[PDB]
Amino acid sequence: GTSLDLLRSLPRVSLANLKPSPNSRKRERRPRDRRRGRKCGRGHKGERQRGTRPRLGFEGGQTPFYIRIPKYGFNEGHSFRHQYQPLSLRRLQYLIDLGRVDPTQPIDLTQLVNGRGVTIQPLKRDYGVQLVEEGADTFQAKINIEVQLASELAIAAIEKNGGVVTTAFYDPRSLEILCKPIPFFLRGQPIPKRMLPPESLVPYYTDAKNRGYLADPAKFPEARLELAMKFGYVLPDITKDELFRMLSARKDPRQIFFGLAPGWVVNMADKKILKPTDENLLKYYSS
Amino acid sequence: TFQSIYSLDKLYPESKGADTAWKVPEHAKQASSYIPLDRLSISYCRSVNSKAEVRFHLASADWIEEP
Amino acid sequence: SVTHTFHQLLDMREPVFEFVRPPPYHPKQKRFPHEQPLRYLDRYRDSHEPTYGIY
Amino acid sequence: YRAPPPPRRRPGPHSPDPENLLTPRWQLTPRYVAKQFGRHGAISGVPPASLWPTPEQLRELEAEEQEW
Amino acid sequence: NPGFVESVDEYQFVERLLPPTKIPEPPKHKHYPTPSGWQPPRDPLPSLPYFVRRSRMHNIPVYKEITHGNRQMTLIRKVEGDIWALQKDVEEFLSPLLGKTPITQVNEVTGTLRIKGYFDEQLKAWLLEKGF
Amino acid sequence: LTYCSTRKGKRKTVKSVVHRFLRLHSGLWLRRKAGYKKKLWKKSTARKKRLREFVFCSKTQSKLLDKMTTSFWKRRNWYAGDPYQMYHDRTNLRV
Numbered sequence: 001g002t003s004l005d006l007l008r009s010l011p012r013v014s015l016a017n018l019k020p021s022p023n024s025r026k027r028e029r030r031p032r033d034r035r036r037g038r039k040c041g042r043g044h045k046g047e048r049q050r051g052t053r054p055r056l057g058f059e060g061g062q063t064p065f066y067i068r069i070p071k072y073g074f075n076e077g078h079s080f081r082h083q084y085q086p087l088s089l090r091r092l093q094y095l096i097d098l099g100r101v102d103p104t105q106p107i108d109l110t111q112l113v114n115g116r117g118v119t120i121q122p123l124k125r126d127y128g129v130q131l132v133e134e135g136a137d138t139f140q141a142k143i144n145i146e147v148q149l150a151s152e153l154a155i156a157a158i159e160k161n162g163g164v165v166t167t168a169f170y171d172p173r174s175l176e177i178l179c180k181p182i183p184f185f186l187r188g189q190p191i192p193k194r195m196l197p198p199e200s201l202v203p204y205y206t207d208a209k210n211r212g213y214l215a216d217p218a219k220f221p222e223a224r225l226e227l228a229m230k231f232g233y234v235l236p237d238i239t240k241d242e243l244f245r246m247l248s249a250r251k252d253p254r255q256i257f258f259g260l261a262p263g264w265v266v267n268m269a270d271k272k273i274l275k276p277t278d279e280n281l282l283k284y285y286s287s
Numbered sequence: 288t289f290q291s292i293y294s295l296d297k298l299y300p301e302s303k304g305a306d307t308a309w310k311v312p313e314h315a316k317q318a319s320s321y322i323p324l325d326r327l328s329i330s331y332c333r334s335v336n337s338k339a340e341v342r343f344h345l346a347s348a349d350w351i352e353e354p
Numbered sequence: 355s356v357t358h359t360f361h362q363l364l365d366m367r368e369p370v371f372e373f374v375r376p377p378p379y380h381p382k383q384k385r386f387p388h389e390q391p392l393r394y395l396d397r398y399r400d401s402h403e404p405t406y407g408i409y
Numbered sequence: 410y411r412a413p414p415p416p417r418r419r420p421g422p423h424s425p426d427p428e429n430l431l432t433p434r435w436q437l438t439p440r441y442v443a444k445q446f447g448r449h450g451a452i453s454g455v456p457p458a459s460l461w462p463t464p465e466q467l468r469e470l471e472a473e474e475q476e477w
Numbered sequence: 478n479p480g481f482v483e484s485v486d487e488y489q490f491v492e493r494l495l496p497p498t499k500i501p502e503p504p505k506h507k508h509y510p511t512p513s514g515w516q517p518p519r520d521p522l523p524s525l526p527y528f529v530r531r532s533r534m535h536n537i538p539v540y541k542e543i544t545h546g547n548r549q550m551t552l553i554r555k556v557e558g559d560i561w562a563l564q565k566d567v568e569e570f571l572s573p574l575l576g577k578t579p580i581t582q583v584n585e586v587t588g589t590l591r592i593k594g595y596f597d598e599q600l601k602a603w604l605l606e607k608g609f
Numbered sequence: 610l611t612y613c614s615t616r617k618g619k620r621k622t623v624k625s626v627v628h629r630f631l632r633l634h635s636g637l638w639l640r641r642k643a644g645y646k647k648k649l650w651k652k653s654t655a656r657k658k659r660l661r662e663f664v665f666c667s668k669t670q671s672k673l674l675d676k677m678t679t680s681f682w683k684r685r686n687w688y689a690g691d692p693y694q695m696y697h698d699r700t701n702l703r704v
């Protein structure tokens with residue numbers, strides 16, 4: 001624009017002409033002068049001028065406020081409670097529209113992470129993502145998605161458009177590998193197995209109404225229909241759909257990645273995969 | 288495809304069919320007083336709460352028994 | 355019979371009225387409600403269902 | 410003048426000297442040997458069979474799994 | 478005999494896992510606006526003196542901001558050309574709503590415009606009409 | 610408190626605060642009432658009801674409690690089934 005024309009007229013830019021942005025630096029004040037010297041802002045002789053006032057929270061000898069209030073367990077066990085990041089249907093629809101997630105293929109945590117759709121902190125006790133009903137009315141996509149937790153209304157929205165949603169469990173060690181797979185391959189170790197849910201979480205993941213990954217497949221057809229009746233839509237049949245194979249794809253309950261089995265080694269340097277030939281090893285991984 | 292002792296086939300042997308879960312349940316048109324959607328007319332008004340209205344002609348409607 | 359009068363001969367849809375009381379009075383909201391119970395936050399909310407913002 | 414060559418990271422697998430007293434200990438573990446294969450594939454020279462657990466290690470892994 | 482067998486066929490799944498470094502360009506849609514609400518810039522470009530560019534995420538750069546805990550503002554950021562012309566248009570567009578001329582700041586060095594009060598939704602719709 | 614620790618050079622949390630108060634992400638703090646388990650036989654029915662409640666803290670108390678805890682206790686927590694999910698935010702507040 002016109003600004004660059006000004007440069008042509010003005011003298012050369014050099015190390016003798018530099019200037020900071022105005023107001024970017026304040027002035028630091030030393031106690032030399034009369035305004036800021038003498039008593040130097042500390043007051044008259046006492047404990048505070050000399051520099052030895054009591055600590056924060058001390059009230060002069062009466063029992064302090066933060067210790068006269070009774071103890072109660074608001075934060076008991078906080079470091080052991082499980083955490084799930086929320087993913088709303090507004091956010092999911094937004095991501096598909098801009099092309100940062102590919103709806104043709106199945107969607108799992110790895111694909112969500114790779115598109116910056118979600119940020120996962122395993123060291124802060126994140127165990128995965130839960131689908132949230134907000135934005136359900138305007139969801140107009142057909143997809144295959146796997147999440148750790150789901151809500152009643154969120155499941156309805158996905159399926160009404162002819163899609164599949166399922167709930168799956170990952171352990172702390174597996175979750176770290178899932179989010180950042182490439183650094184694991186650089187280590188040179190075999191892929192580990194996936195542990196089953198703790199005892200308390202077994203009822204949730206073996207229940208059809210939750211779309212669990214360990215529930216009886218025979219009972220799914222009944223559950224899907226009842227949602228259609230309750231929320232007033234017609235249950236579509238996906239077997240007719242051309243993409244039935246994609247929508248039906250599901251991984252083994254002891255598998256982390258779709259096309260890879262426990263016990264394999266990924267040699268990324270020369271694009272090869274190594275498999276063990278020992279019966280004891282094969283039996284261990286397959287169990 | 289990899290399979291393990293905990294694969295759904297082994298855990299639930301009877302329902303080994305590939306499409307057992309995605310089949311539309313047969314019948315049930317008489318289940319829980321199935322309300323035919325086509326008969327009803329549904330309109331959404333943005334009245335905050337987004338109101339919904341359902342209207343149908345009582346006498347003409349035949350799914351409900353006359354008495 | 356009033357429904358019939360509005361329909362048959364007046365030939366218009368009948369209106370329905372309801373008795374509405376004025377909204378309850380609450381003092382102005384404070385950033386720090388000292389020595390007030392947890393319920394204080396409920397008095398000033400409009401919707402009862404959770405929201406998730408950018409997430 | 411002419412500037413000197415740009416600094417470059419040394420390429421290729423790294424095998425520290427075991428006898429030297431001042432070599433850091435962490436570089437002498439089996440984990441470090443495994444990393445070399447992961448970064449550099451076959452050029453490392455690490456016997457691929459070593460990556461998997463040995464039979465004595467396998468028994469310990471299985472024993473712990475049953476316990477917990 | 479070695480204990481490992483090497484296969485090259487299954488590496489395709491590994492290739493899927495690789496993450497990208499560049500933001501993908503949005504995909505073409507038959508019907509706009511897109512279900513979420515996104516709408517691409519119109520073609521041909523507007524002929525106004527000032528041009529407003531989009532962010533790396535392909536959104537209109539209008540932001541809500543606050544300071545001191547009680548001062549509410551809105552910001553239009555990536556302006557090229559004559560920033561002063563844009564100020565005149567914004568004052569005319571917003572003046573009837575407020576009942577007074579809005580208070581604004583113009584930063585020529587950073588090419589941004591700052592307005593007192595929250596007017597992000599109206600400005601976003603206003604800019605789309607002009608087709609930036 | 611410890612402004613600069615020997616081993617890490619960081620501030621330290623006062624753990625007697627963490628055992629007595631709850632912090633909502635907006636900046637409010639919750640507590641109980643002193644004496645809510647003591648000599649209940651000599652307290653009236655209205656007095657006992659007041660004691661059972663959860664109560665908020667003043668501005669000066671909130672300021673002091675913030676200095677005595679580190680940032681980790683001030684983050685966003687996404688607990689499934691949280692019973693305080695609806696109290697972490699403010700609505701219709703002009704201030």
Ligand SMILES: [Mg+2]
Pocket residue numbers: 028029
């Ligand atoms: Mg100084």
Ligand SMILES: [Mg+2]
Pocket residue numbers: 119121
């Ligand atoms: Mg986080």
Ligand SMILES: [Mg+2]
Pocket residue numbers: 389
């Ligand atoms: Mg008091």
